[PDB]
């Protein structure tokens, strides 16, 4: 993990979060549950789908492979044709594989980055009014109903509160 | 006390991907973009069936090899399938000038229609009904190429021939003819009285003068003699002119190129399955939305891009455990 | 935004900052204004200019395109020549486009990273003596003249101060 | 209370770029690196003007087609512009051996200087002033190729010719000659008494023996006869040797390759504008510091690199709003 | 430095740390010394070695270079053969160079990222019980023997302690 | 008070690398992956020594140029080294048909074994001991190509020859022969009484009829005459048939292709050092574990991949100061 988030300081993933990729787990006086962060998840899906389609669109003008015949005394240009189509085959195969690997990495670090950024979106909302447990959770110093939870989810967290 | 937690999705998937720094990385979601499966059949290409020569080559087909009478009248095709080693090619030994260059022409043609441009009955002053050999047996009797006619002397005399054909059609004409190289002078005289023979051929652009090459050669299909075939593409309104005093294997049937277009010639041992595809390889057809495949380079139709890889998986989901 | 900085927790850019790419906005008892961070901006410009020139220098040995003639019975090698020059054309066009996209991304995340790093350069200078407003500003607990502002700009911030 | 803030630059720009994950991203600054504009004119190349054959081909030019008298004396050129379909080529029907291979030679040559190596006056025992045809009319009277001479019999007799030329120059010599293929024996006799003719040609490396091909062919420009032209490059101090008893279209003017170097042959319908460039395409010249362009593959000069893209913009500035 | 770590807020490297790439410097009542962080360093070495071998493995199917002869009247296909092998030479050379540059960058930002992530691994262990000096060190509010140091190294840091 | 610190490794290294944004970046550790050094010698290739023709070409070698008697009997080789400009090639002027195409064949052959297929003593009715020239002097006396024999008339008469050879071997046979083009008719008669001569050659697939080309040509090595050599590959059990009434340069020794396989032909001015390698370039051998090199494109053996770069260093360590 490049950013330390996925499989780092956040040691694991949520099997119980099924409504998207990212989200929150709340546990207050009105029950406990997993919610999925809409807009970040969406922007991620946009990123990766647009990425796949980008990769495809970048390889619609590849190399064809027409077959050519040569006689018993045209061994040279036959060899040339072979060597050259085989050549292009090698280069485009290389391009596809390498691009795929690179963008796989870029993708994983992309998800990692999104998790990091969410964690900071919430952390900067709850300055003193919450404590870092360390494992990716924020513990409340006050009692926080489902509406405060939602205000943190949609970003409309009303900070004006005590803490001791 | 209340609390709130940040985390990420996990699930029950085993799909692995590979990165530059780490291989076989397990993820929640992944997308294969590599098509690795074919049907093992040669199918129709967009509804129109390909011409599949069985054990026939293009030479044997077009020259009218008797053993190729399966293809005397071939309809419009999508692509052409020839085996690697057609058993039926030049039943009578010899050669085909610019053969590969003609095969290349076939890649831009979807339909010939054979037409008699010179009737066999028209040779009043020669024999056109004795041009046979045991090197081309049809049904256990000595025969020959159907599209051309092997003239020989009549009443101990082979008069000079001045035969011509004006392409009055609006289509291009593939015209084929040949020369017979005997193996001794006695044979040359025996078939075509004149000892020193030739065949002159002219069009708008064509200006050639063949002479036979008498020479001692080994037996191919029981004959030491050879046939050498030549071709040309007659334009509409253009005419072809033959003058010869011997060894002349004359045209009889020619092919009207009535439908041009993007076609191809496949090499494949496979035979026709009764299917239909938008993409065809020599080892099977493809039906996939996949952008890549690793079946065969030589591909025809509306197809994915060929790639040498054994495995290409793109990572859609995140890191799982 | 990969790092959350640009168009993330810092919601917008400064139209009023015209003396460079990065900088600070101060608002004290001696007036209010935008200053531009010299060395970071410079190192960025170096990065991207050297990047452009790098990309160019990586494509001085491309593929030429000499024309060749073939007769009525040389259709095959004519087709080969065509198919091969068209091939190289496809591969170099691919290379240029793909490289451009990739380095565009690398560039944006590069600027994002520079903003992040500046924000941390100042944050680590003003430990307790300033509060995170959250939107990319640090509020002073003490009164800070233009010289403290400059000391923070050039990195020479004298920390020895009270805060309550 | 005092405060300090961190932020980034924004401005009033609409320049968009594209990334792998996000398209049409707006930024503060951006740099186009793709040149997409030409002048539509064929310009001088580094001050030296190209040889532009109008409706002339290389064959028609070099053989001295009368309709190509515009180019009897061509100065040093940068590149060569030929149209796709030159109307004036082989005014008298026939062929040019290894034509494409000669055109390729022109790519390494910047200047020929024509010199008379065989004066027309030197043919005492033949006719060199009756070698004309209506297939090559100049000003409404039957003419012929200027650089070569069509010898015919004199006083009902065509004696064998033994003409030779020693390249005493220090330059390479492009030497051209030809053979006339008549359309009947009566014509062969009519022009060059000898029924069975030939033309032998020898140098240090050259050893060939042409014989005419009498054959019935169709009319091109009103003639059923054909001319076939051959060429060679004579080394300095090397000599060329002709022996012939007929059908010989002799050299008269040859070309001294006095300036070699990187040149080219362009195909273009465009004509000469009065300009100057360091980079030239067949559809226009380029004046740019841009590293790329999308005008034409076939490029000559000090040029940017061609690319198929319609749009290439590199992101210099950061994300704007 | 992309993440600000190497040659950024941590101004320099340790000549005295010779037992690996990353680690810690402790200075307590039982002596002063450099220790090397085992598992992170190892995972890095894995990353970069696997990277090198990946790059190599991606270029085992390159382009050969067979020589071909052509006569005095085969100048065209001779030129074609030359132009095409020279072409492939250019493209594979390009590929190797460009890949190398890119992965050099990826490598440096990879080390930077590892340093960042370690710094956060320790920072999240020592919440209040230590102060950020700013230069990449954490100062102890309590006295910390070699065993607390080790507990922080191997991640088994027992937090239950005072600080004033 | 106690404290703990986080940091990174530094050391005493000066190895620089380059990135996309920053050049000449100093690091603690780095890995060169580019081999830039050779031995300057042509070595054995995996223990088996290459055939190095000194100033001999393939033509001169195989035809049995006397000045090439160093290679009368060549053992199994790995690759073949020819100089750019071999001084000893066709000692007697003329040509070698499909020479390049034969050189290409050599790339798949590791061993010929020369065998006499036609003894010089067998020409009872002709002279086979007077086929010499001063254009091919061996030890200061007029000689000729050893592998072939230049027959001339005996007792003022050159009878027609009907010589044949059945390849009874289980190996393919490279068979070479030739034709002599004289420079005048008097010479033609002088050497081979018959004024109008030819050489017919036939196999299963071969059917050719050479005729000499009398022509006036310049002197190469003191002779205006020319020799043109032809070749073919005789299959096992196939036979070759010669019929000729003159100008026939007959085969005598032929080469059994007894060991096929991946070989090559190198162009190099270098001579044999006494070494051994798994990778060989025309300018030196390579012994490296490095994956790349920048020595020469044309590489043979178990080799690293060639690349144009002057410097390729991969960054293993981190940023140092
Ligand atoms: C015991 C005995 O004497 N047997 C002969 C027998 O040899 C002979 O057979 C003929 O052999 C000749 C060559 O010697 C040819 O090979 C003939 O075969 C063919 C063929 O079948 O194609 C025969 C054919 O009839 C010929 N057609 C024409 C128009 O001539 C061709 C043609 O000549 C070849 O292509 C020539 O190169 O030859 C074969 O008949 C028979 C008949 O002569 O008589 C026996 O007594
Ligand atoms: C009503 C009538 O009888 N009309 C004839 C008329 O046919 C004839 O014209 C000649 O026709 C012949 C072929 O039959 C040629 O085509 C001649 O044309 C040319 C040409 O112009 O190039 C003529 C030219 O003078 C010839 N030059 C020489 C040296 O012979 C060439 C040359 O022969 C061709 O290239 C041959 O292939 O032919 C054309 O004059 C005229 C004159 O004979 O007489 C009418 O009565
Ligand atoms: C003063 C004087 O008269 N001198 C002659 C002198 O010219 C002549 O030398 C011969 O010159 C002829 C051509 O005129 C040939 O060039 C002969 O050279 C060769 C050769 O050495 O290869 C000679 C050789 O003996 C010939 N071999 C055969 C089988 O004929 C070849 C061969 O003819 C050539 O390859 C032909 O193209 O020619 C050279 O001897 C001598 C002898 O005639 O007499 C002097 O008096
Ligand atoms: C063929 O016939 C047409 C008219 O039917 C004629 O114009 C043309 O000249 C003829 N072709 C040739 C080559 O003579
Ligand atoms: C041409 O002349 C030179 C001397 O002027 C002579 O040496 C040379 O042999 C001649 N060329 C030929 C091929 O005879
Ligand atoms: C050569 O000999 C074999 C038997 O030894 C025979 O079968 C074959 O026909 C002969 N080759 C030819 C071409 O005649």
UniProtKB/TrEMBL annotation, chains A, C, E:
Function (record text): Binds to sialic acid-containing receptors on the cell surface, bringing about the attachment of the virus particle to the cell. This attachment induces virion internalization of about two third of the virus particles through clathrin-dependent endocytosis and about one third through a clathrin- and caveolin-independent pathway. Plays a major role in the determination of host range restriction and virulence. Class I viral fusion protein.
Localization per record: Host apical cell membrane; Virion membrane
Organism in which the protein naturally occurs: Influenza A virus
Subunit organization: Homotrimer of disulfide-linked HA1-HA2.
Protein name: Hemagglutinin
Membership in a protein family: Belongs to the influenza viruses hemagglutinin family.
Disulfide bond sites: 144-148
Residue ranges the record marks as coiled coil: 56-90
Keyword Plastid: no
GO CC annotation terms, alphabetical: host cell plasma membrane; viral envelope; virion membrane
Gene Ontology molecular functions: host cell surface receptor binding
Alphabetical UniProt keywords: Clathrin- and caveolin-independent endocytosis of virus by host, Clathrin-mediated endocytosis of virus by host, Coiled coil, Disulfide bond, Fusion of virus membrane with host endosomal membrane, Fusion of virus membrane with host membrane, Glycoprotein, Hemagglutinin, Host cell membrane, Host membrane, Host-virus interaction, Lipoprotein, Membrane, Palmitate, Transmembrane, Transmembrane helix, Viral attachment to host cell, Viral envelope protein, Viral penetration into host cytoplasm, Virion, Virus endocytosis by host, Virus entry into host cell
GO BP annotations listed: clathrin-dependent endocytosis of virus by host cell; fusion of virus membrane with host endosome membrane; fusion of virus membrane with host plasma membrane; virion attachment to host cell
Main location: host cell
Automatic annotation (TrEMBL), chains B, D, F:
GO BP terms, alphabetized: clathrin-dependent endocytosis of virus by host cell; fusion of virus membrane with host endosome membrane; fusion of virus membrane with host plasma membrane; virion attachment to host cell
Cysteines engaged in disulfide bonds, as pairs: 43-275, 56-68, 91-136, 279-303
Keyword match Lipoprotein: yes
UniProt-annotated location(s): Host apical cell membrane; Virion membrane
Protein family per UniProt: Belongs to the influenza viruses hemagglutinin family.
Assembly behavior: Homotrimer of disulfide-linked HA1-HA2.
Function according to Swiss-Prot or TrEMBL: Binds to sialic acid-containing receptors on the cell surface, bringing about the attachment of the virus particle to the cell. This attachment induces virion internalization of about two third of the virus particles through clathrin-dependent endocytosis and about one third through a clathrin- and caveolin-independent pathway. Plays a major role in the determination of host range restriction and virulence. Class I viral fusion protein.
Protein name: Hemagglutinin
Organism whose genome encodes this protein: Influenza A virus
Originating gene: HA
Shown residues within the full chain: 17 to 336 of 569
């Amino acid at each position: 993990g490049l950013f330390g988030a996925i499989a780092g300081f956040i040691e694991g993933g949520w099997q119980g979060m099924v409504d998207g990729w990212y989200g929150y787990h709340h546990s207050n006086e009105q029950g406990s549950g997993y919610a999925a962060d809409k807009e970040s998840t969406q922007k991620a899906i946009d990123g990766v789908t647009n990425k796949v389609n980008s990769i495809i669109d970048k390889m619609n003008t590849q190399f064809e492979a027409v077959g050519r015949e040569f006689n018993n005394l045209e061994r040279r240009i036959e060899n040339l044709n072979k060597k050259m189509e085989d050549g292009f085959l090698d280069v485009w195969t290389y391009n596809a594989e390498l691009l795929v690997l690179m963008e796989n990495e870029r993708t994983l670090d992309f998800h990692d980055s999104n998790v990091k950024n969410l964690y900071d979106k919430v952390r900067l909302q709850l300055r003193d009014n919450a404590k870092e447990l360390g494992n990716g959770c924020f513990e409340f110093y006050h009692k926080c109903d489902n509406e405060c939870m939602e205000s943190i989810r949609n970003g409309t967290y009303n900070y004006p509160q005590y803490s001791e | 006390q209340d609390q709130i937690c940040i985390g990420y999705h996990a699930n029950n998937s085993t799909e692995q991907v590979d990165t530059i720094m780490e291989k076989n990385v397990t993820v929640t979601h992944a997308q294969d973009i590599l098509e690795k499966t074919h049907n093992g059949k040669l199918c129709d290409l967009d509804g129109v069936k390909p011409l599949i020569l069985r054990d026939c080559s293009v030479a044997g087909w077009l020259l009218g090899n008797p053993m190729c009478d399966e293809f005397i009248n071939v309809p419009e095709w999508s692509y052409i399938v020839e085996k690697a080693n057609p058993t039926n090619d030049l039943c009578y030994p010899g050669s085909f000038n610019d053969y590969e260059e003609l095969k290349h022409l076939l890649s831009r043609i979807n339909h010939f229609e054979k037409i008699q441009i010179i009737p066999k009955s028209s040779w009043s002053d020669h024999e056109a009904s004795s041009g046979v050999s045991s090197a081309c047996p049809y049904l256990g009797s000595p025969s020959f190429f159907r599209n051309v006619v092997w003239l020989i002397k009549k009443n101990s005399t082979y008069p000079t021939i001045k035969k011509s054909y004006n392409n009055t059609n609006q289509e291009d004409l593939l015209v084929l003819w040949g020369i017979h190289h005997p193996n001794d002078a006695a044979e040359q005289t025996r078939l075509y009285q004149n000892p020193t023979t030739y065949i002159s051929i002219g069009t708008s652009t064509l200006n050639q003068r063949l002479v036979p090459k008498i020479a001692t050669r080994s037996k191919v299909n029981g004959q030491s003699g050879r046939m050498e075939f030549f071709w040309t593409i007659l334009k509409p309104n253009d005419a072809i002119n033959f003058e010869s005093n011997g060894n002349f294997i004359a045209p009889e049937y020619a092919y009207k190129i009535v439908k041009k277009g993007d076609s191809a010639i496949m090499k494949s041992e496979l035979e026709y399955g009764n299917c239909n595809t938008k993409c065809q390889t020599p080892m099977g057809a493809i039906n996939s939305s996949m952008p890549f495949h690793n079946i065969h380079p030589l591909t025809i139709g509306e197809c994915p891009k060929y790639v040498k890889s054994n495995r290409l998986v793109l990572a859609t989901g995140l890191r799982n455990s």
